[PDB]
């Protein structure tokens, strides 16, 4: 009953490649018909769904989108319920706004027992990944919940002040990821550390230089940074938060294993049919999708499923279906939620265009094939970031996706919500 996570044995779905338009995505984000100009460009989205509780974060910039003053930083939490037609909807229950909107960047979310912990970064010099040699390093953590019990004390806004961050050998850590996992008394936020470039160990042998005659063998080393001549490289990983030990909890960092290592990017680890699956956004030469099963937690070993049918578009320098190393920190976030693990199938909103990001399509694909595709927008609609999270309805499976489509009705890149029903039977 209600909205639950993937735990157990759901209804069997179609296991055959079909293309007779078996998918029909609906929209659950009917926006107000704004008239005239907008000047309210929505950047930095966030969508984290866990145990029927969803979180949302977006920044409204006045004027342009890249260079625009911030107006309101909305951090919202809510429950996932039905829309009266067996279609899930996002009923946001609480909304908060920090005092300074131009200082909150790269938030996160996790739900352990009754709190939706939002882990953002405090920056007074600009963007964290853009300005790394001048960022302070302090992190912000807010305890948002559902049903704050108005006739009470501070159980609606409490912002936990982190004492100090204990880094093993890193300099600065920052939460870079929509959603993490919970393990009872330990929160795990997908984050990235700004490691010193002059103190990184990576032998120039593990680089995939099998058939890369046009490429250069020294491309793997100078690729984990935002720029070639950069002082801080992005090492993805997790932030462990022990809210059950000590008077005030602490934060530690655990890096990702060296197996198929890439640059730090918005990552997401999510539980499924038991174990957690980790996905790292392909913001590097590895245009192929990077996701796999997590074996261990402390050393963070994640086996990556080699998928060669789904890729990520670029900017005419590192297009889709590219494997050889190349210096290009250009990409978009396109996750893929694992549906069933008996046969590896993942559903995600990707971009079927080896060019500028256009034509978002919801693809449910197996290891190496394209099982089902759904076209939810015209081939001219532009996208910027796609987040997808699947869950269990009363008895079926439904996937909610936030897509940065070009709203033709308002002439602005607007985050819209879409609900996709997994086909139960091919017939």
């Amino acid at each position: 009953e209600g909205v639950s996570n993937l735990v157990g044995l759901p209804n069997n779905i179609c296991l055959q490649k079909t293309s007779n338009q078996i998918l029909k995505p609906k929209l659950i984000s009917y926006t107000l018909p704004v008239v005239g100009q907008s000047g309210t460009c929505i950047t930095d989205p966030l969508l984290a769904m866990d145990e029927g509780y969803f979180a949302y974060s977006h920044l409204e910039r006045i004027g342009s989108c890249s260079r625009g003053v911030s107006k309101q930083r909305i951090i919202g939490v809510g429950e996932v319920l039905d829309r009266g037609d067996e279609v899930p909807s996002l009923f946001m229950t609480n909304v908060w706004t920090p005092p300074n909107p131009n200082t909150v960047y790269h938030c996160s979310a996790v739900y352990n027992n009754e709190f939706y912990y939002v882990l953002c970064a405090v920056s007074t010099v600009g963007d964290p990944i853009l300005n790394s040699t001048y960022w302070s390093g302090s992190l912000m953590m807010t305890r948002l919940a559902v049903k704050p019990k108005s006739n009470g004390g501070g159980y609606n806004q409490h912002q936990l002040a982190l004492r100090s961050i204990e880094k093993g050998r890193y300099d600065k850590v920052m939460p870079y990821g929509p959603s993490g996992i919970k393990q009872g008394d330990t929160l795990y936020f997908p984050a990235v550390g700004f490691l010193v470039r002059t103190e990184f160990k990576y032998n120039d042998s593990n680089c995939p230089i099998t058939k890369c005659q046009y490429s250069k063998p020294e491309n793997c080393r100078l690729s984990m940074g935002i720029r070639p001549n950069s002082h801080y490289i992005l090492r993805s990983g997790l932030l462990k938060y022990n809210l059950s030990d000590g008077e005030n909890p602490k934060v530690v960092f655990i890096e990702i294993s060296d197996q198929r290592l890439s640059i730090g990017s918005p990552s997401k680890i999510y539980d499924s049919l038991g174990q957690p699956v980790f996905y790292q956004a392909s913001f590097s030469w590895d245009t192929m999708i990077k996701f796999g099963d997590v074996l261990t937690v402390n050393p963070l070993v994640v086996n990556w499923r080699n998928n060669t049918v789904i890729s990520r578009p670029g900017q005419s320098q590192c297009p889709r279906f590219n494997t050889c190393p190349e210096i290009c920190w250009e990409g978009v976030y396109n996750d893929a939620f694992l549906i069933d693990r008996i046969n590896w199938i993942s559903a995600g909103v990707f971009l079927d265009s080896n060019q500028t990001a256009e034509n978002p399509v919801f693809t449910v694909f197996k290891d190496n094939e394209i099982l089902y595709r759904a076209q939810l927008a015209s081939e001219d609609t532009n996208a910027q970031k796609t987040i997808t999270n699947c869950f269990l309805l009363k008895n079926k499976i439904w996937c909610i996706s936030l897509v940065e489509i070009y709203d033709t009705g308002d002439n602005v890149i607007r985050p819209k919500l879409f609900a996709v029903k997994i086909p139960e039977q091919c017939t």
Partner: nanobody
Amino acid sequence: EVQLVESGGGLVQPGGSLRLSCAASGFTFSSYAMSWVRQAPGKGLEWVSYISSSSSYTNYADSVKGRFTISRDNSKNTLYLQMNSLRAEDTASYYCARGLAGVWGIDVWGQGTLVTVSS
């Protein structure tokens, strides 16, 4: 399908009262949020009141704490937004929609109602 009508008018003198009303057809009104949102000409969406199910929690949009008071009724589907001591900074349009605030819209918004504070 789903119908949400926003009645009421405007053209009021700064300082007074206003009794807004809402309509609901389709979905169940007793089990959903059905909050209010405000849209000023030239500005974006501004949340003014959020009501949950049977009275447990009510957020009154701290920016305007004591000027507004939202009320719900499960017997007759109608969401009241009785305003008290309005000002000239409240000239905008009100919409009773599912979901607290932001950019998320569950169902179709609808026509709405215009409220003007002048003279």
